[PDB]
Amino acid sequence: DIVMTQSPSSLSASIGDRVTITCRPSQNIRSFLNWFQHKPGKAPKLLIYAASNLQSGVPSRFSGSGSGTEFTLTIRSLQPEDFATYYCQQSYNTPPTFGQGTKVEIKRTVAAPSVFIFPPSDEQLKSGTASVVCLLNNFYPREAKVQWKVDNALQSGNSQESVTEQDSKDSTYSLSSTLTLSKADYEKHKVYACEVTHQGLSSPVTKSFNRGE
Amino acid sequence: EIVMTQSPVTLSVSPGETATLSCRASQSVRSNLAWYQQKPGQAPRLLIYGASTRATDIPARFSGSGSGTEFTLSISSLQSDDFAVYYCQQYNHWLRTFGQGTKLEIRTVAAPSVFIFPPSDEQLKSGTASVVCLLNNFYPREAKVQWKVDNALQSGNSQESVTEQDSKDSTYSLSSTLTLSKADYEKHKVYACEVTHQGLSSPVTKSFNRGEC
Amino acid sequence: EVQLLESGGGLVQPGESLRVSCAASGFTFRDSALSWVRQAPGKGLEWVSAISGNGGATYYADTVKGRFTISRDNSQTTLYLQMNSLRADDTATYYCAKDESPPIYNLMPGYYSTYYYMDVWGKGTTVTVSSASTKGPSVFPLAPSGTAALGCLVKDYFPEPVTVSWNSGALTSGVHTFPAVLQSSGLYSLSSVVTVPSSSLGTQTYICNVNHKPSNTKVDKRVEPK
Amino acid sequence: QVQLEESGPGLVKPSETLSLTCSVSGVSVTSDIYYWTWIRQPPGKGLEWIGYIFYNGDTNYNPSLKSRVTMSIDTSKNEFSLRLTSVTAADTAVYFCARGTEDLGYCSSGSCPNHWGQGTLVTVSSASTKGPSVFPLAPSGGTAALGCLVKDYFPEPVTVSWNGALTSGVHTFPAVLQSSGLYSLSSVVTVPSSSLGTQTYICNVNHKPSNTKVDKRVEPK
Amino acid sequence: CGILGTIIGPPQCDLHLEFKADLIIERRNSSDICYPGRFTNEEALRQIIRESGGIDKESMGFRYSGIRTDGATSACKRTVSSFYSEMKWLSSSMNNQVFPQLNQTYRNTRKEPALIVWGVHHSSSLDEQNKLYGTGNKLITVGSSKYQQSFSPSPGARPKVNGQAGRIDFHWMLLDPGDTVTFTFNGAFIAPDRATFLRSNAPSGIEYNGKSLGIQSDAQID
């Protein structure tokens, strides 16, 4: 019932930079405050206990400070593996409650995506559906625009995108876009193309294939 | 002669969760205290009067409490139509005063789509140049625009405004206008809007070169 | 039904006078109190004054302590507010609000109970105080250059408001008309935009329809890719 | 010093009962000083503490959930469990089990879970389970990319390995919800182009709710 | 200095081991302990100290035969790693060597009731208990004419504070004059070296400084 207000909700910082996250409980909680780190697909990890105590295996660049109604987690020189969502947690009265979290993203140099296009497999076409996939691999920053073209007509409404979370070693993103057509419409047209616009490409890059070659 | 201060200026609460508001008041006040729900484009509507006694035929999810100085307003089950602004008044000093106002929000982080518009030839003939930067359909509301003209940061010659939260998709949009004289506009080449927002891993710049397209 | 209707208001030069009426209709027998509350777009609410019975109020805020005077005409059931010596900050949407008190107070039915809360609010009348001088807008295209955005800039008009529609109201999806901003010249500027399929630019005409009733000006502006 | 593995259905229908189990390795669930906790996080929302249980019987559940939740410890199996009745879509979440150590000098009783499991997703839905179809992403200045497409499964998640042997350079993308209401994702890996003529790559796509294992091997069209 | 720390001597409380005071001021960030642990009946114990007048210390006279008594920790640094000033940390004298069943009796000679504090050590790991105190069952029993209780370590990891997963818990008693406290333990035991005597129970023999008020204040002194 104690409300934990964490700020900011999100931040981006370069490798080597000093990062600071604040937590303000809705009442004084003395030192009964913990900090958790949650990396994509891993178990949340207690980093700091009782406001300032570093947990085993946590690098000394992480430090917790404060008491009462204002607490700070500092990461003194950000590393790519520190990409995660961080939460404060009060242990002062029941129920334990958590801050809404702070997503820490890493700023790095621009990296152009590598682009790959995959035609639908023949096995799927027997199902009456054709999925065409475009892969944008290992790029930074997150914007990449993927335009589909079928015999040079721009498509809209018949594709979906998915983006990975930032990579824990090189801090890049990857993105898949899937163009879905009925098999009947797919065989009525010939040239299938994925066109990618991104800050790392001086002009857009197109990967394409010819149906039935 | 008796100031009212509400906290915070604006809060973001997911639909369904309870949203607690604050109405701190200098000097004692208990007998009379009224809460209001002023939806945009409408007149205020009475919710609670006195302190806890709610108005006639208003939902039971609107709760009121407080005494003397600190006053609270909690909305139990939140609905998407509760995007109104809330105020609190007081007795008496023979002079009732209102509160500052608390904006209530109701989604997934969304980066703005950014568009830049050169001045029209029609406008330039009248002697002025408005360059417009549009940040469309983003969430949360916090966003920053910077204008550069031949890479020089502009100060004092722009204005911006932001829409109410969109009922249809819970996003915001923002328009910024850079205003130059005709003579000044024709003296420079590169016009750029740089946008910072939580949904963007790096700030995004949209630009044009005057006299190119 | 306890609704009241506010009439009057408009544009006035600073230093002039203006009174706003409030037709108290419905359940109100008008032995109960009434109040005025003003709000400027971009600011919060602020209580202005109150009236009770006959001449029991005499209740004015410190901002208008020497300028505003509150009248009551129970024979025609209308509440008034003579706003004299108007200044620039007096520009607001003046609301006429009902006043209710706990039944323990208000001993004599007519006189003032010094503890009131407003229950039924009115539609409100907008009063603008400037040295402005009504002016219709210029309308400029924001030209589009899977999804495209296009729009119209409605610039250099006074006073508010303007209305914008697209394709005579046939285009609604994806339209955003922004709040106007006030420029240093004292004129307003606003933008209205719409997002549309890129593929529609070439087949489909987009026209923004702008209406500024204060100057009875009406503009349709076709927005073309360039 | 302890390992904590969560298990349970993955899909529960609305109004039915959600049951989860936590397999504990490295310590005994019969120890007087540890307590066992569940926490959850709805998609895109905050962490919510559910409760704790001690071997001696002392429990405490979040008041938001107390009238629907129970926990137990199974000493024979070295497990502890969560039971949540009358579920709705609000209970779709990643559920984490955790251990803490009673430490009243620094923490309220049962309030500092410091060894967590990685969490298991539970989806509350009336839709049925569906196993994925898995399709190859075949290779086209030194480096080639290949992968496998995992299309049309429900609910989440799938896991993908390449060969647990090929691991460097792997990207498994977050799933996308298609307009059909089913999920799809891709897993990719970068490898030497000089490798395409002679070495083996098999993506392994595994989906426990549909009890599916599908192997695709990848190569030039 | 935390107040309870005056009794058992962390490096913090080094100045104030034998303090004489009419008015005692606690402070907010003060830590009663160097090596993570907590006092049983803690709030009750302080209220005794606040009104004490201050405290006088005298040695309980304990001596040891075959044990490490010089136990030191990273937690009590003090030029070099150290322990509580007023206690001895008892260890096997050879790693993994099973610890001796020992007995101690101390009797309260003085007219004022003595204050006695002792420790139970909960080792970081089941291993560390073994390394420190040997292996097998560990039992500690404390006996006084009004007091008896038995303590056993419950070894495990706990969140790392001061760099230690392990904990030490302090239990205290008041001993009437002419009363024996008997200490019996096979290990995990932190032993009092000195007894604490209140100054407002003194016989006006010039130690005596009677009746203090203990306050909690954020303000300076004047």
CA distance linking residue A85 with residue A39, whole number of Å: 7
Q: What are phi and psi of A125, to 5 degrees?
A: -60, -35
Q: How far is CA A127 from the centre of its chain?
A: 33
Q: Are D212 and D131 in contact (CB under 8 A)?
A: yes
Q: Which CATH superfamily is domain B108-213 in?
A: Immunoglobulins (2.60.40.10)
Q: A23 CB contacts (<8 Å, ≥6 apart)? A: A4, A5, A6, A7, A33, A35, A66, A70, A71, A72, A73, A88, A99
Give the other-Cβ count within 10 Å of A149's Cβ.
Answer: 16
Structural contact between residues B128 and B180, judged by C-beta atoms closer than 8 angstroms: yes
B150 vs A53: CA distance, rounded Å: 50
C147/C143 Cα distance (integer angstroms)? 13
Does residue D90 sit at the B interface (CB-CB below 8 Å)? yes
| Alpha-carbon torsion (A107, A110, A114, A115), positive or negative | positive
Query: What whole-number distance in Å separates Cα of residue E99 and Cα of residue E118?
Result: 18
Classify residue E186 by its DSSP letter: S
- Chain A positions touching E165 (Cβ under 8 A) are 56
Return all residues near B59 (Cβ < 8 A) that are at least 6 apart.
Answer: none
Taking alpha carbons only, the member of D208, D167, D189, D162 closest to residue D8 is: D208
Looking at the complex, report in whole angstroms how far the Cα of residue A128 sits from the nearest Cα belonging to chain B.
33
On the CB side of B33, CA atoms within 13 Å amount to: 25
**Resolution expressed in Å:** 5.4
In angstroms, rounded to a whole number, what is the distance separating the alpha carbons of residues C66 and E3?
A: 64
Yes or no: say if A183 and A123 are a contact pair by the CB < 8 Å rule.
Answer: no
Within 8 A by CB and 6+ apart from E33, the residues are D105, E2, E5, E10, E168
Chain E contact partners (≥3 CB pairs within 8 A): A, D
What CA–CA distance (Å, rounded) separates D176 from E29?
Answer: 50
Burial of C63 (0-12, 13-18, 19+ CB in 10 A): middle
Question: How far is it, in rounded angstroms, from Cα C178 to Cα C155?
Answer: 12
The token duo for D218 is 């990848």
Distance between alpha carbon B21 and the CA centroid of its chain, in Å?
17
Edge-to-edge order in the sheet of strand B190-196: B152-153, B144-149, B190-196, B204-209
CATH of B1-106, one of 3.40.50.620, 2.60.120.260, 3.30.160.270, 2.60.40.10: 2.60.40.10
Instruction: For residue C138, give the H/E element and its range.
Output: strand C138-142
Report the DSSP beta bridge partners of residue D93: D122
Smallest CA-to-CA distance from E111 within E211, E18, E204 is with: E204
User: Where along chain B do its domains lie?
Assistant: 1-106, 108-213
DSSP calls for B40-64: TTS---EEEETTTEE-TT--TTEEE
Residue C225: helix, strand or coil by DSSP?
Answer: coil
Q: Identify whether the C-beta of residue D48 lies closer than 8 Å to the C-beta of residue A100.
A: no
Tokens at residue A27, please?
A: 């009442």
Instruction: Pick the residue from chain B with its C-alpha nearest to C149.
Output: B115
Q: Is the peptide bond before E11 cis (omega within 30 degrees of 0)?
A: no
Residue A80 CA: distances (Å) to CA of B174, D171, E178 = 33, 16, 67
Q: For chain A, say whether E159 makes contact (Cβ under 8 Å).
A: yes
The residue type at E192: P
| Closest-approach residue (CA) in chain B for D44 | B108
Query: Which chain D residue shows the shortest CA-CA distance from E35?
Result: D105
Is the CB of residue C88 less than 8 Å from the CB of residue C147?
no
Q: Are B23 and B64 spatial neighbours (Cβ–Cβ below 8 Å)?
A: no
Query: Alpha helices, DSSP H only, in B79-177?
Result: 121-125
Interface of A with B (CB under 8 A): 3, 9-10, 12, 105, 107, 140-143, 166, 173, 199
Residue D135's SS3 state is strand
d(CA E196, CA E198): 7
Are the Cβ atoms of B140 and A199 closer than 8 angstroms?
no
Question: Any chain A CB within 8 A of the CB of E30?
Answer: no
Q: What one-character-per-residue DSSP string does C155-191 give?
A: EEEBSS--EEEEGGGTB-TTEEEPPPEE-TTS-EEEE
Compute the distance between CA of residue B205 and CA of residue A33 in angstroms, rounded to an integer.
Answer: 40
- CA dist., res. C213 & res. A4, Å (int): 50
Q: Collapse the DSSP code of A8 into the 3-class scheme (helix H, G, I; strand E, B; otherwise coil) and give the result.
A: coil
CB A116 within 8 A of CB A135: yes
Please tell me the distance from the alpha carbon of residue A176 to that of residue A203, in angstroms, as a whole number.
20
Length of chain D: 221
Residue C139: how many other CB atoms lie within 10 Å? 25
Contacts of residue D44 in chain B, CB cutoff 8 Å?
108
Nearest-Cα residue of chain E relative to residue A58: E160
**Could you tell me which chains touch chain D, where touching means 3 or more CB pairs under 8 A?**
A, B, E
- DSSP H helical ranges for chain E: 5-8, 42-50, 126-133
> DSSP label at B154?
P
Task: For residue C19, give every residue at least 6 positions away whose Cβ sits within 8 Å of its Cβ, in sequence order, or none.
Answer: C8, C71, C80, C81, C82, C83
Q: Do chains C and B touch (3 or more CB pairs under 8 A)?
A: yes
Contacts of B38 (CB under 8 A, 6+ apart): B44, B45, B84, B85, B86, B87, C45
Residues facing C76 on adjacent strands: none
Distance CA D120, CA B38 (A): 43
- B16:D90 CB<8 A: yes
Sign of CA dihedral E161, E162, E168, E173: negative
| Cis preceding linkage at A113, omega within 30 | no
- Tell me how far apart the alpha carbons of residues D16 and D85 are, in angstroms, rounded to a whole number: 6
Which residue from D113, A89, A50 is spatially nearest to E36, judged by alpha carbons? A50
CB A136 within 8 A of CB A175: yes
In angstroms, the CA B168 to CA B166 distance is 5
Question: Between residues 168 and 207 of chain D, which touch chain A (CB distance below 8 Å)?
Answer: 171-176, 178-179, 184-186, 188, 190
Q: Is E160 on the interface with A (CB under 8 A)?
A: yes
Nearest to E183 by CA among E111, E98, E101, E122: E101
Domain A108-211, CATH number (from 3.40.640.10, 2.60.40.10, 3.40.50.12780, 3.40.50.300): 2.60.40.10
Contacts of E214 (CB under 8 A, 6+ apart): E3, E23, E24, E25, E26, E46, E47, E49, E50, E51
* The two domains B1-106 and B108-213 share their CATH topology (first three levels equal): yes
- Best residue in A34, A52, A56, A65 for a mutation probing chain E (most E CBs within 10 Å): A56
Distances (CA, A) of D200 to A116, A137, C25, D217, E104: 20, 22, 86, 8, 73
As a whole number of angstroms, the distance between CA C99 and CA B89 comes to 13
- How many Cα neighbours within 13 Å face the side chain of C122? 28
For B96, counting Cβ atoms within 10 Å of its Cβ (0-12 exposed, 13-18 middle, 19+ buried), the class is buried
Could you tell me which of E173, E182, E221, E176 has the C-alpha nearest to residue E48?
Answer: E173
Structure-block tokens of residue E14: 């080094």
Tokens found for residue B108:
């997934």
B125, two tokens: 């003939």
| Pick from D33, D100, D105: CB nearest E38 | D105
> Distance (Å, rounded) from C-alpha D59 to C-alpha D177?
38
H/E element holding B182? helix B182-185
Element (H, E) at A123: helix A122-125
Between the two ends of chain C, the Cα-to-Cα distance in Å is 55
Give the span between the Cα atoms of E34 and E10, in whole angstroms: 6
Name all chains with 3 or more CB-CB pairs below 8 Å to chain C: A, B
Which has the closest alpha carbon to D134: D221, D202, D220? D202
Which conformational region is residue E93 in: left (phi greater than 0), alpha (psi within -120 to 50 degrees), or beta?
left
CA within 13 Å, CB half, E23:
6
CB atoms within 10 A of CB E149: 12
Cross-strand partners of A185: none
Stated as kind and residue range, the H or E segment containing A187 is: helix A183-187
**Rounded Cα–Cα distance for residues C35 and C24 (Å):** 11
Show the 3-state SS of D87-119: CCHHHCEEEEEEEEECCCCCCCCCCCCCEECCC
Kindly list the residues of chain E whose beta carbon comes within 8 Å of any beta carbon in chain D. 33, 36-38, 125, 154, 156-159, 161, 167
How was this structure obtained? X-ray
Q: How many CB pairs under 8 A join A and C?
A: 11
Report yes or no: E186 and E138 within 8 Å, Cβ to Cβ: yes
CATH architecture group of domain A1-107: Sandwich (2.60)
Q: Which two tokens stand for residue D162?
A: 């390449």
Residue C98, φ and ψ in degrees, nearest 5: -65, 160
Q: Tell me: cis bond preceding C144? Omega within 30 of 0 counts.
A: no
